[PDB]
């Protein structure tokens, strides 16, 4: 159920300016 992790991450990265390419390092949900 990777889509659960993906949806979390997409919602988390909702404040990235237009042309963004960045590595986010945090205490993110794991599998
Ligand atoms: C979280 O993701 C859902 C879609 O699964 C979306 O409808 C909702 O608005 C998102 N929340 C935030 C804060 O982006």
């Amino acid at each position: 159920h990777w889509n659960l992790i993906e949806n979390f991450l997409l919602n988390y990265s909702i404040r990235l300016p237009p042309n963004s390419d960045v590595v986010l390092g945090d205490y993110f949900p794991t599998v």
Side-chain angles (χ1 to χ4, degrees), residues 8 11-14 16-31:
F8 181 91
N11 275 14
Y12 179 98
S13 60
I14 199 168
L16 267 60
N19 295 175
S20 176
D21 184 353
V22 63
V23 170
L24 307 176
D26 205 354
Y27 297 107
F28 287 113
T30 65
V31 298

